[PDB]
Design an enzyme around this catalytic site. Structure first.
Site, PDB file in Angstrom:
ATOM      1  N   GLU A 125      37.052   1.027  15.918  1.00 50.14           N
ATOM      2  CA  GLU A 125      35.686   1.500  16.121  1.00 50.14           C
ATOM      3  C   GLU A 125      35.191   1.014  17.482  1.00 50.14           C
ATOM      4  O   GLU A 125      34.495   0.006  17.607  1.00 50.14           O
ATOM      5  CB  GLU A 125      34.788   1.033  14.984  1.00 50.14           C
ATOM      6  N   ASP A 126      35.596   1.739  18.523  1.00 47.51           N
ATOM      7  CA  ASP A 126      35.095   1.565  19.887  1.00 47.51           C
ATOM      8  C   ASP A 126      35.330   0.155  20.428  1.00 47.51           C
ATOM      9  O   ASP A 126      34.622  -0.291  21.333  1.00 47.51           O
ATOM     10  CB  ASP A 126      33.605   1.921  19.969  1.00 47.51           C
ATOM     11  N   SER A 127      36.309  -0.563  19.888  1.00 50.30           N
ATOM     12  CA  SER A 127      36.618  -1.908  20.351  1.00 50.30           C
ATOM     13  C   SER A 127      37.806  -1.870  21.313  1.00 50.30           C
ATOM     14  O   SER A 127      38.222  -0.805  21.777  1.00 50.30           O
ATOM     15  CB  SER A 127      36.858  -2.830  19.164  1.00 50.30           C
TER      16      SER A 127
ATOM     17  N   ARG B 141      32.822  11.361  22.852  1.00 48.90           N
ATOM     18  CA  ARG B 141      32.109  10.960  24.055  1.00 48.90           C
ATOM     19  C   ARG B 141      32.386  11.916  25.206  1.00 48.90           C
ATOM     20  O   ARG B 141      31.511  12.140  26.047  1.00 48.90           O
ATOM     21  CB  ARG B 141      32.494   9.533  24.439  1.00 48.90           C
TER      22      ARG B 141
END
Lengths: 46, 82, 525, 51, 49, 404, 51, 51, 49, 115, 263, 67
Positions: free
Chosen positions: C204-206, C374
């Site tokens: 998750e976006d890490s 994104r």
RNA sequence: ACCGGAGAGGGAACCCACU
């Protein structure tokens, strides 16, 4: 007891006692930096 | 109300299950006598869970009806969910 | 217009506006009119000429500056009023030529369209290849990326000063960075990122970081915090810097005061930690009570320098700056130049990290699931052009509207250096050694380290200090405060139906109290 | 609707209009909550707006 | 004497006006510092438009 | 402990958890638990409350534990689902042409907590033993679960025509007696939708068993992803250069159609639609033409899309992205809208000082015929920035009304 | 205690050679603020050697 | 209705796939500051004495 | 701030080349706090006489 | 401040055991080998050498958590053959492989230097 | 049910790197060799830095980090030293550490470059990598000094391996490659024609990748071990092999002890 | 500030290459020729010097704290 | 008992920033 300081302008080590105005005996500059300490510093290279 | 007139559900709801377990394991933590022979487990919450599964918790539940009346349901007497 | 283009009487900032369908003709001279320079276009040709470009290219000797260019009648300053009544062309070559006619009546041309951007948005490589909210987020996070914020940061006794060890100018840059001086004071390191799902610690976006690179100094920084204090305030309550002595002064913490020098301060270069006295200050008690400044809890740094001087009231004044290096750990917030933020999820050593056919292991691994929604295609193009540039020896050019470079040209340039034309590479698994079935997209990308470290946000509480008015826990990380079990958390507990937990949170965990009330009147007794 | 058809028709119409906005997105909310809201908003015989 | 007006850095009456980079370094000032801000109580202040 | 992300909107925002002590200084929560909390790990902070009395500790244990909170009463659906690498890797793993070696099968089975230590007979015994991804996911699936789901790319005519129960595309997920027989697992099978495989698991077996099901899925699939691998790159966004020509042709004919509609409107040859004025009917024609062009270019993009593409490998699995994201990346960004209309005339009867007055053409009112690969011409960049500014403003403004 | 605020040197164990300052001290162990790392760790008094 | 509470911590969350959904990873600094009150009983008396 | 009228916050067409379209805070100051374009210059005023 | 020491990855505490052996009750002739302060570097080679033994019915390793320093090796062998002796035979064959590799590598170096 | 017989041939030997091929061994064994190359090869690097004076513009911990990243020529002393955690002595002795000294003061108006040449060791054979470069090249810069600036420090060098810190990583680039032509197809090329040929591949320009063989197993592991300068590239491999062998022997000893205590 | 001692990715020594790199750039050598004249074959090591900004020179222009 | 380990350390306002 001595607590030698450093003038910001002329970089002159000058003796100052406690409860005195922050003044350099030459150049009249009024900002003082203290010193580097004498106690041991141990740094890991990490 | 009398034992004849019991209109509430015979299933022990999740809130009763949570609160009875908490308040019985608290008693076990204050060195209340256990109702079920334990096999060396030391956690009062697991002890209370074992008592609930064995249907030996010495607690009854007072279910207040909206009108103001109440019913006394023994933990051994109503169906546990899990 | 003739006078304004020669600066005879009308200065350049003055704007003259002719409304034509409605007969007004307005002239504005007041202050506050926002305007930008534009080129002057006659019939279909610019007034900017090869002679202008030549005599201005040899500047610093012919001193033909922008002011001389304005005086030549080549450029004008056009505000919004005058921008309504004028016809611009984006590019003289592409918009002033014989073709199927669109306007053929241009009046001005733009110097370069990339100048519509600001300062923080002019550091974005390929900003027209990104979704606009990504660009906004990058413009917001460019103010938080740590770097050498100023050259004289050592003389600058300043609180909350952040500098990076090894800042780098980006491998791929816009032509607008040389005017922001970003290549002289950069904030970030050109990391080699591999956009892949390696273990799941970046899901998750890490992001995964290379532990060996961090050991080598990757994104390592030092945090400067400065502490000020001044002595004074009453007729006899005189403040003084000294070492507070236990038999003399009444109020003292358990903190050790031997670290102070006898003038009441620490000498620079002394290791310090939380709840350690830094400035020993005592006030006379009508024996004495101290007002010593304690180091902020859980800082654990080292004193950098100590300055003593006099404020404008002639009293002794001291400022002390403390160094504390911040080695990148998991949870530290990292971001790229495209609004792709993320906290470090895990740090693997070089052995655990995937690697190319060579020994190249990515410094950073980000989740590929951050691109498709994104839509930071500028990030992918930056990662490609960075490899192209680091192999060619040139600094990559990422001017927004260049139109002289595109993905096909970048791919063809990359294919000449022995790599897959689309930037993909065959990485090998760092644990098993088996080559990854899919091929990994990898290349140098300019990542930034933001100020939002995790050591500056982590805090807990277990019956700490209490407020004075209502006996509830204090608020704030610095005051050892407690979190707010707010009105929505109360509602969530109601929905759970945990009434005992709700009462425990709001009654015993905050402020248990007992009062005595009469049975006849409900008034407190 | 309250002036013309009455409070019970109000409950049904309010349920329909409240479900229309939720299901317009394609999302689903169980009828339990819509019924409870439209009931507590109309359990007093008048339109008890939630303010 | 009417008072003392706070003055903006790198302005036309600031003491750093037109100084060369070597002089700015001698004064412990950053040659890359754009200026345009006030120093009041030893804290940089910037008038937002 | 009870553990929440502060903007608590529903009772799946404050959920119980068992504490595990880990070295570094960050809270670590499982990735399925991200969905209820609405976490993002992009700098999020979550605050943790420890129940102090043993009574309330037991109360949290029996009421608000996350395995007990899998299915919401809001929409009778599960709230946690396989997300964000594990979902895509499950889609790639449960494909028909996925075969695992003997050592790889042992390595994967080592990460199963609910494994009896019994190695299943491989789907292929000779020439050499190979297992299948479905054969391992069958061991992953607990108990005896029976459910039937359909994959994202399931064709409509497949059910009507032959090969109904023998799927050529390996769609129509069928789980029988706790064993995955056929079908590729996607969002519509392992996600938060109603009737999904996890929903059936929670409704049949216990909440603890479904917890173990999450744990086994995530561990074994993330460890198979070490071998498989999943990325995204600039090559995933390129077309065949015949698709580029097709998209350019579609854009050019759409522009010619818009120009001729403008001509008909100017020569008064356009009849207003009943119920609308001339201006709005012209707007409707322009929007219809532009939307049809964008849809056709997007469809051409998906048709050109390859089997090995990572954009498709994500969107088909449903882990991240949508089918219009690929279109905006590859074919056409689209037409920018502010308040539903085209870009308004900020200047005097025009949009930017680069456009002639009264220019209703697609380029002059916000349509972006370029994709995210070819970049945006400065006008299109400004229009897209202005369009995204509306959504950014709405995101901030909406909160102060919704929370109230 | 006596050891409080006294610069010690861990002369035995995994942290051998580190200079720190004793924050807390007991009969058995003592907490040492390490000069190098950002961390305060506790070691035995038999492992410490003052300067 | 809402108020500050004791025995509460807050820090940055980060993903970890190697623990069950019911587990949460907390740092040793947070765990070493927040406390839970156990009541002594002859069952856990020795463990609590050692603690 | 905290106003439900989004019209002032929106990026206006006349912001071309004088105000950065991308750069703005994401909080309750979207579109209200806006920075300055690169070559954008603000007139300083002079006498119209 | 929560950063573990760098030497934590390979250094046993006082009282820790380098290896722990637990019988697996689920299936016969199966055992779980828990190794402390080791990682993939040892687990992968141990698993690969175990997989060469025809009398080994199951062999695999895992690291329960990368932040932790442990590795679990589960070995199931045919009856009349023990998982413990399978593990020790794998180790003693891998050691022989490494010794032979050392000898051949140093010989190759010697002949590469002016040969 | 026994070990296989690996063979090694050297394809290139240099003071900078060693490139060679290992045959008839396992993928896991090859990866573990590549892995010990980075992690478990002990070398000598300085881990204890005491700064008596630092008037430079780089702060003390910056200077200590840059000093620690400096490699030290430890070819045979690393074998005869001991870990400081294992040595019986106090803080430091010559048997487990190496003392370094650095006293540089800038007095002239010219900028003084503090390099690794200015580090004076107590042991003449354990020095930085400025030893021999004849058959002009510079030396590792530490800090630059202005006139009047100086720094004085005393440092100790410990024995460590790359699992602790990257400063004990003896190798710079460890190229690892097996099956250069995708015969096993452990990786799958969507367009094999677009992928450049490997250096070790044996294919004509017409062919893009080797034909698939279901019976194949990973062999012919290609290494290119590039040394940073501390250890010789040829002795890095020997030290890694010895370290892995002794680690396996220690694990076997612990297992034998546990089994004989369980029985 | 100053050139790192080692490349972050590779670990190859880069700290000694900066002055030689500047000297080579003080000639007809381009960056692409100077980098591989210094022996930087991998782009991980090449970027270390290619993208490095040497701020220690700007730092040394300030007078020291002492004398 | 030689002091009793004392820690509770204002507040309001505005600004920036994080999710």
């Amino acid at each position: 007891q001595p607590m030698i300081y450093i003038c910001g302008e002329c970089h002159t080590e000058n003796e100052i006692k406690s409860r005195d105005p922050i003044r350099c005996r030459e150049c009249g500059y009024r900002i003082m930096y203290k010193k580097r300490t004498k106690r041991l510093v141990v740094f890991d290279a990490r | 109300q009398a034992n004849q007139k019991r209109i509430t559900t015979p299933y022990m709801t999740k809130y009763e299950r949570a609160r009875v377990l908490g308040t019985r394991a608290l008693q076990i933590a204050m060195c209340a006598p256990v109702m079920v022979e334990l096999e060396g487990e030391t956690d009062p919450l697991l002890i209370a869970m074992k008592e609930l599964k064995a249907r030996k918790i010495p607690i009854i539940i007072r279910r207040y009806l909206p009108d103001g009346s109440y019913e006394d349901w023994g933990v051994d007497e109503l169906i546990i969910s899990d | 217009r003739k006078l304004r283009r020669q600066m005879d009487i009308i200065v350049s900032e003055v704007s003259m506006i002719r409304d034509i369908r409605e007969r007004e003709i307005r002239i504005y001279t007041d202050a506050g009119r926002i305007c930008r320079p534009l080129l002057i276009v006659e019939k279909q040709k610019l007034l900017l000429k090869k002679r202008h470009i030549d005599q201005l290219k040899e500047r610093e000797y012919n001193n033909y500056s922008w002011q001389d260019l304005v005086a030549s009648g080549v450029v004008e300053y056009i505000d919004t009023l005058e921008e309504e009544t004028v016809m611009l062309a984006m590019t003289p070559d592409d918009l002033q030529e014989k073709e199927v006619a669109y306007c053929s009546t241009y009046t001005h041309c733009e110097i370069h369209p990339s100048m519509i951007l600001g300062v923080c948005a002019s550091i974005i490589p390929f900003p027209d290849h990104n979704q606009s909210p990504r660009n906004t987020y990058q413009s917001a996070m460019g103010k938080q990326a740590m770097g050498v914020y100023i050259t004289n940061f050592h003389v600058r006794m300043d609180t909350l000063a952040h500098v990076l060890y090894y800042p780098q100018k980006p491998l791929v840059t816009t032509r607008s960075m040389e005017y922001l001086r970003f290549r002289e004071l950069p904030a970030g390191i050109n990391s080699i990122v591999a956009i892949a799902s390696y273990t799941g610690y970046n899901q998750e976006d890490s992001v995964i970081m290379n532990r060996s690179a961090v050991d080598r100094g990757f994104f390592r920084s030092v945090f400067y915090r400065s502490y000020k204090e001044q002595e004074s305030k009453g007729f006899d309550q005189e403040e003084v810097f000294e070492k507070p002595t236990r038999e003399t002064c009444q109020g003292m913490r358990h903190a050790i005061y031997d670290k102070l020098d006898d003038d009441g301060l620490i000498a620079p270069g002394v290791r310090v930690s939380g709840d350690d006295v830094i400035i020993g200050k005592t006030v006379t008690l009508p024996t004495k009570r101290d007002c010593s400044t304690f180091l902020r809890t859980s800082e654990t740094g080292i004193v950098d320098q100590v300055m003593v001087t006099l404020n404008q009231e002639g009293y002794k004044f001291c400022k002390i700056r403390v160094r504390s290096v911040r080695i990148p750990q998991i949870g530290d917030k990292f971001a790229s130049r495209h609004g792709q933020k993320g906290t470090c999820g895990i740090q693997y050593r070089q052995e655990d990290m995937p690697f190319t056919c060579e020994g190249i292991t990515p410094d950073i691994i980000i989740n590929p699931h951050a691109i498709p929604s994104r839509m930071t295609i500028g990030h992918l193009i930056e990662c490609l052009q960075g490899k192209v540039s680091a192999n060619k020896g040139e600094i990559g050019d990422a001017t927004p509207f260049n139109d002289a470079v595109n993905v096909q040209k970048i791919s063809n340039l990359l294919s000449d250096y022995g790599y897959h034309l689309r930037g993909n590479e065959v990485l090998y698994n760092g644990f098993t050694g088996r080559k990854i079935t899919s091929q990994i997209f990898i290349g140098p990308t300019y990542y930034q380290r933001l100020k939002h470290m995790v050591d500056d946000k982590i805090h807990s509480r277990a019956r700490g200090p209490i407020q004075i008015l209502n006996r509830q826990p204090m608020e704030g990380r610095s005051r050892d405060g407690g979190l707010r079990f707010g009105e929505m958390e109360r509602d969530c507990q109601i929905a759970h139906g945990a009434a005992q937990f709700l009462r425990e949170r709001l009654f015993e965990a905050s402020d248990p109290y007992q009062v005595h009330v009469c049975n006849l009147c409900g008034i407190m007794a | 609707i309250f002036t013309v058809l009455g409070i019970e028709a109000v409950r049904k119409a309010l349920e329909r209009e409240l479900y229309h906005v939720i299901s317009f997105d394609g999302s689903y909310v169980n009828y339990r909550h819509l019924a409870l809201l439209c009931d507590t908003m109309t359990c007093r015989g008048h339109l008890m707006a939630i303010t | 004497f009417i008072g003392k007006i706070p003055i903006m850095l790198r302005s036309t009456y600031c003491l750093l006006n037109g100084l060369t980079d070597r002089d700015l370094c001698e004064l412990n000032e950053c040659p890359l510092d754009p200026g345009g801000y006030f120093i009041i109580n030893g804290s940089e202040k910037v008038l937002i438009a | 402990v009870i553990f929440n992300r502060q903007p608590t909107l529903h009772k799946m925002s404050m959920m119980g958890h068992r504490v595990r002590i880990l070295p570094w200084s960050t809270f670590r929560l499982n990735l399925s638990v991200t969905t209820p909390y609405n976490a993002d790990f992009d700098g999020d902070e979550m605050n943790l409350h420890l129940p102090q009395s043993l009574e309330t500790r037991a109360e949290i244990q029996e009421l608000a534990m996350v395995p007990r909170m899998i299915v919401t009463p809001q929409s009778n659906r599960p709230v946690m689902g396989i997300v964000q690498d594990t979902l895509t890797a499950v889609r790639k793993f449960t494909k028909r042409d996925v075969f695992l070696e003997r050592g790889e099968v042992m390595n994967l089975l080592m990460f199963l907590s609910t494994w009896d230590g019994k190695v299943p007979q491989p789907a292929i015994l000779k020439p050499r033993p190979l297992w299948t991804g479905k054969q391992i996911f069958s061991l992953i699936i607990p108990g005896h679960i029976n459910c039937i789901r359909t994959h994202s790319t399931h064709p409509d005519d497949e059910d009507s025509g032959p090969y109904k129960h023998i799927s050529p595309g390996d769609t129509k997920v069928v789980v029988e007696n706790g064993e995955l027989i056929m079908g590729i697992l996607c969002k519509k099978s392992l996600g938060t939708s109603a009737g999904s495989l996890v929903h059936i698991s929670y409704l049949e077996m216990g909440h603890d068993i479904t917890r173990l099901f999450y744990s086994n899925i995530q561990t074994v699939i993330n460890n198979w992803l070490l071998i498989e691998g999943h990325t995204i790159g600039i090559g995933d966004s390129i077309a065949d250069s015949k698709t580029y020509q097709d998209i350019q042709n579609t854009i050019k004919k759409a522009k010619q159609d818009v120009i001729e509609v403008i001509e008909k409107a100017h020569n008064n040859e356009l009849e207003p639609t009943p119920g609308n004025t001339l201006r709005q009917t012209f707007e409707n024609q322009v929007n219809r033409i532009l939307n049809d062009a964008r849809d056709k270019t997007g469809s051409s993009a998906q048709k050109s899309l390859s089997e090995y593409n990572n954009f498709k490998s994500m969107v088909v699995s449903g882990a991240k992205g949508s089918k219009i994201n690929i279109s905006q990346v590859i074919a056409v960004v689209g037409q920018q809208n502010v308040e539903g209309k085209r870009i308004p005339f900020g200047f005097k009867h025009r949009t930017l000082p680069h456009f002639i007055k009264d220019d209703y053409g697609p380029e002059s009112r916000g349509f972006v015929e370029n994709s995210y690969l070819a970049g945006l011409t400065p006008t299109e960049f400004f229009f897209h920035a202005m369009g995204g500014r509306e959504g950014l403003i709405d995101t901030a403004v909406k909160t102060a009304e919704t929370g109230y | 205690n006596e050891l409080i605020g006294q610069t010690v040197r861990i002369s035995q164990g995994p942290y051998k050679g580190y200079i720190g300052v004793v924050k807390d001290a007991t009969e058995s162990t003592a907490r040492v603020e390490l000069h190098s790392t950002c961390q305060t760790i506790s070691v035995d008094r038999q492992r410490l050697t003052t300067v | 209705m809402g108020k500050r509470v004791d025995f509460s911590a807050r820090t940055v969350i980060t993903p970890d796939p190697n623990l069950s959904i019911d587990q949460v990873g907390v740092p040793r600094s947070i765990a070493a500051n927040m406390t839970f009150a156990e009541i002594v009983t002859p069952f856990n008396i020795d463990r609590l004495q050692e603690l | 701030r905290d106003g439900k009228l989004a019209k002032p916050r929106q990026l206006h067409n006349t912001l071309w080349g004088m105000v950065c379209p991308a750069e703005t805070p994401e909080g309750h100051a979207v579109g209200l706090v806006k920075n300055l374009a690169l070559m954008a210059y603000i007139s300083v005023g002079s006498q119209p006489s | 401040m929560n950063a573990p020491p760098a030497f934590e990855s390979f250094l046993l505490f006082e009282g820790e055991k380098k290896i722990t052996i637990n019988k697996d009750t689920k299936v016969p002739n199966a055992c779980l080998f828990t190794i402390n302060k080791e990682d993939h570097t040892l687990g992968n080679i141990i698993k690969s050498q175990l997989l060469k033994d025809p009398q080994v019915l199951f062999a695999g390793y895992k690291v329960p958590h990368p932040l932790e320093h442990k590795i679990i090796i589960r070995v199931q062998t045919t009856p009349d053959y023990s998982p413990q002796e399978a593990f020790t035979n794998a180790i003693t064959d891998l050691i022989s492989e490494l010794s032979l590799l050392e000898e051949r590598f140093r010989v190759a170096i010697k002949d590469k230097q002016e040969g | 049910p026994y070990a296989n017989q690996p063979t090694v041939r050297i394809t290139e030997l240099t003071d900078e790197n060693v490139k060679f091929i290992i045959e008839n061994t396992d993928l896991a064994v090859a990866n573990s060799i590549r892995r010990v190359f980075i992690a478990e090869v002990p070398i000598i690097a300085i881990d204890w830095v005491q700064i008596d004076a630092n008037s430079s513009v780089l702060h003390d911990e910056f200077i200590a980090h840059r000093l620690g990243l400096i490699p030290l020529t430890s070819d045979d002393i690393v074998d005869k030293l001991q870990y400081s955690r294992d040595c019986t002595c106090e803080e430091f002795c010559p048997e487990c550490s190496v003392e370094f000294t650095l006293d540089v003061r800038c007095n002239e108006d010219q900028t003084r470059h503090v390099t690794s040449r200015d580090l004076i060791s107590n042991s003449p054979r354990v020095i930085p990598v400025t030893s021999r470069n004849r058959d002009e090249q510079d030396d590792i810069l530490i800090v630059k000094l202005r006139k009047g600036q100086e720094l004085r420090l005393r440092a100790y060098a410990k024995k460590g391996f790359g699992k602790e810190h990257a400063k004990w990583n003896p190798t710079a680039g460890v190229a690892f490659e097996y099956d250069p032509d995708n015969a096993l197809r452990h990786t799958v090329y969507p367009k094999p024609e677009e992928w450049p040929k490997s250096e070790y591949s044996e294919l004509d320009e017409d062919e893009s990748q080797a034909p698939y063989d279901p019976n194949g197993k990973p062999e012919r592991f290609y290494y290119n071990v590039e040394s940073c300068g501390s250890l010789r590239p040829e002795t890095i491999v020997l030290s890694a092999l010895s370290g892995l062998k002794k680690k396996l022997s220690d694990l076997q000893t612990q297992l034998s002890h546990e089994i004989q205590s369980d029985v | 500030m100053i050139i790192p001692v080692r490349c972050f990715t590779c670990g190859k020594i880069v700290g000694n290459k900066w002055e030689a790199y500047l000297g080579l750039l003080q000639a007809e050598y381009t960056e692409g020729d100077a980098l591989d004249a210094l022996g930087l074959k991998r782009y991980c090591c090449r970027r270390m010097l290619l993208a490095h900004v040497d701020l220690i020179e700007k730092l040394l222009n300030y007078a020291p704290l002492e004398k």
